[PDB]
Design a protein around this nucleic acid. Structure first.
Lengths: 95, 106, 79, 98, 97, 80, 105, 95
DNA sequence: CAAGCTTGCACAATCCCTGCTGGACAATTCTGAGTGATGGCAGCTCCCACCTTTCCTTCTTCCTTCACTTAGACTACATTTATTCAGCATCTGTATTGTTGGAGTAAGTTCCATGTTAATACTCACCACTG
DNA sequence: CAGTGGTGAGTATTAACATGGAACTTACTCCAACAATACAGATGCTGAATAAATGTAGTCTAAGTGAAGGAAGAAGGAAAGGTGGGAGCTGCCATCACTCAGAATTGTCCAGCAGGGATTGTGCAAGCTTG
């Protein structure tokens, strides 16, 4: 009778954002959940190692940026870094 | 009077849930306030990219429902995404159509 | 053994999926040995996770964790 | 009547199974093998159905990749058939031993 | 006199598998490392331990790669190692990503 | 500029000897130089990323060790 | 009065240092009392095994001192330390002397 | 100046307990410090993930036991588990 | 260039399966002290890049000479293609333990802060394994 | 024939241990819904054993060529130094960003209901293949 964590709703929203006419299977949504969880864990763990290396005690957005630069390949890393930086800028200039 | 951080950053992924996941998953004992925003942006970007490629590979095969095969195709056919997911097995996805030209008839 | 339940046509179809056009007659025993070794490793680690869970039903999570530990990440079975 | 030349139906099967996604080992014999291997570790061990299916997906993908590497090994030796020594070479260069 | 082709090769094999020093020369490798680094970020400084570590890594990598290449060549019924063998070792090994 | 040639043919031969290689084609040396250059590219790129994060200009041995553990080729004896 | 947890555990590795590292290495919130003892015992066993094998190798080389090459021989000449340390590269440790059969004359 | 941190004294102690006539270099000493740090990190990370799977919050001796079983091969795992059980039993019996 | 076995391509009619609404409730969000981690600045060592100098261990050609790769010939093994016939996978179906979750209680257990020693890292001096 | 590099006292630092006092994690029942073995039967794809042909793998023999091996001439690298000097590493000083801590409130997520997408079979188109 417990609740369960999922990224399915947001993956579905992004899919409707990028392909408003195509739906998604349930097996494929499970796959998308697994992919999002894996990338989340990779980036967070790399940022945690980065924090321990510099003896800092905080993951700021800078450790996330360095983890993305370390983990994603070239054009993917560039685009992801730009997306994140623009998102943080939009977040800050809205109080 | 409560505007969610996902809207405040213009994202579709949950900034707050990501922040909680970072805090519980003990990566460091203190988590900045731009870390969840950045991470949610990155995850939503990568999701959107794979979903765009899978939607292309679904419209390619005259379908309106993405299945695991289309994700396999969208990943294994892209250089960057196949490098990111080199050691990832996808369930019920198969392999890419590929025959060595040595094995074909002359 | 039940290792013979992986029949010759099964291994031949697997070879077909991998692009193989012609298969020696001694491939089948060697492939059975390779498959058994791989299964041994994965189920050993899965049962280890199950035991540490104080459980006795091997969940798909235990399998996925064992595979991820082996470096062979698997998608679509939850988590 | 009709007798296809040796190799053409091999290409046909290659194209079919690289077009398909379903599993290529029958479910029940693989379930029996999984349970037999598990009995060597702990007894009265029950398996989720999803657990056996995940094990089958894993083993199938592993065997497919190993076969692709074996085929590249066989092509290297200027052959067209795969041999046990090709599997051994692939699993040594990959590291899947010791 | 003249040694037959293969005795000196095996003598070198035994000798260099016995020893443990760095088969590449220090300074040319350091220059290579520095030019790659400056192609990444300009006016970096290094550490003698860091360049020595890079040399240890690279030579271990190349020794392992040549071992795999030798396996491939022997598989093709040769003793001469050729670039196609290096390419096969890399492809099976997993460096084609 | 173009210092890769400093990895002379005798150096490659010596590495091959340590690898148990008996005969060597003359086309090896170019492929080996390309392989070495790409390996170095990856490792030094990751090490310089680590150095930039710590807001430094020196690439110590810690960055090299971390970047080598990233690629999957961890190294013992330079700390870390 | 004061007795170190290592001497009480009958160990040589520092149980206190390992407990601090676990508590600060950020692995969970709370760290059990027997966890650092178990971990230091395991680490001491592993280092004892490697030291044993490397010392045998050094004696086989008639050398009184253990150098990296001896560690490399101790590791790669065993069947389980080689597996545990297969992706590890030992600095200045060299390679096992091996030549393929066909390359022999 | 500052103080550095290592396992040099303890590696020295164990070496004396297994080879009283043998000394150890300094480069080999750094190699063994790196090895000990690496093994500590492996087992600690495995125990962290093990607890995180089972929704626990504590690394007990059981998490370290299962991590030693997971990471090490057969005979090494057997003897390491025996050593750990012996040490924790002596520690509890001396408390 | 005719005739075959395989596949792609177009309809009919389901079935199930992904949409789709909607109450419940955990989890986000707002707000405000509280505070410690982290910038910002000065200053210091220190190791790092740059330069000079022999002194040779390596590198580079160059011939030449042979062993090794490769191309063609050619047999028989050995895999393949189709066939026919048991036979074991499969698909519902049904009961049945059993096993995993989920609550509620209760206490070992671990954190936490404080005081205090004893273990370490480091610093001078000192000889014995290693060329 | 050698010496640079593993080792003894002393000492300042600091962190591990002792010890006593709170939250709190989990263990320990107890119960109660899925749900994974376990047969069990109709059925029906499919694999297993076999004969025929054919087409690869392996062995052989012979040019040819290209790689190693030794011979001399350069030749940069390295080993030892000095020496400027920019950067990392410390410590102090704020100070502002992250953490609890407690109410609102609402985003989301099981649980029930429906249109439509693949689907499964039934038949043309065609189409490469084998002769």
């Amino acid at each position: 009778r417990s609740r369960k964590e999922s990224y399915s709703i947001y993956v579905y929203k992004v899919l409707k954002q990028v392909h408003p006419d195509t739906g998604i299977s349930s097996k494929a949504m499970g796959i998308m959940n697994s992919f999002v969880n894996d990338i989340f864990e990779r980036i967070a763990g790399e940022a945690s190692r980065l924090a321990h290396y510099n003896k800092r005690s905080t993951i700021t957005s800078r450790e996330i940026q360095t983890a993305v630069r370390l983990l994603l390949p070239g054009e993917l890393a560039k685009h992801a870094v730009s997306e994140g930086t623009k998102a943080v800028t939009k977040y800050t200039s809205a109080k | 009077k409560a505007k969610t951080r996902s809207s405040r950053a213009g994202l579709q992924f949950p900034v707050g849930r990501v922040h909680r996941l970072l805090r519980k998953g003990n990566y460091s004992e203190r988590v900045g306030a731009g870390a969840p925003v950045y991470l949610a942006a990155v995850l939503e970007y990568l999701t959107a990219e794979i979903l765009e490629l899978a939607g292309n590979a679904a419209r390619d095969n005259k379908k309106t429902r993405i299945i695991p095969r289309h994700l396999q195709l969208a990943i294994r056919n892209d250089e960057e995404l196949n490098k990111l997911l080199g050691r990832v097995t996808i369930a019920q996805g198969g392999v890419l159509p590929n025959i060595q030209a040595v094995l074909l008839p002359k | 053994d039940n290792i013979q339940g992986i029949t010759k046509p099964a291994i031949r179809r697997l070879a077909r999926r991998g692009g193989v056009k012609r298969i020696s007659g001694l491939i089948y025993e060697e492939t059975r040995g390779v498959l058994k070794v791989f299964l041994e490793n994965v189920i050993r680690d899965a049962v280890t996770y199950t035991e540490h869970a104080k459980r006795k039903t091997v969940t798909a999570m235990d399998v996925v964790y064992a595979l991820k530990r082996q470096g062979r990440t698997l998608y679509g079975f939850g988590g | 009547p009709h007798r296809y030349r040796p190799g053409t139906v091999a290409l046909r099967e290659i194209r079919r199974y690289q077009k398909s996604t379903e599993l290529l080992i029958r479910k029940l014999p693989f379930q029996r093998l999984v349970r037999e291997i598990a009995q060597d570790f702990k007894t009265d061990l029950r398996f989720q159905s999803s657990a056996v299916m995940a094990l089958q997906e894993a083993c199938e993908a592993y065997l497919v990749g190993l076969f692709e590497d074996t085929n590249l090994c066989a092509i290297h030796a200027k052959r067209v058939t795969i041999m046990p020594k090709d599997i051994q070479l692939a699993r040594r260069i990959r590291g899947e031993r010791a």
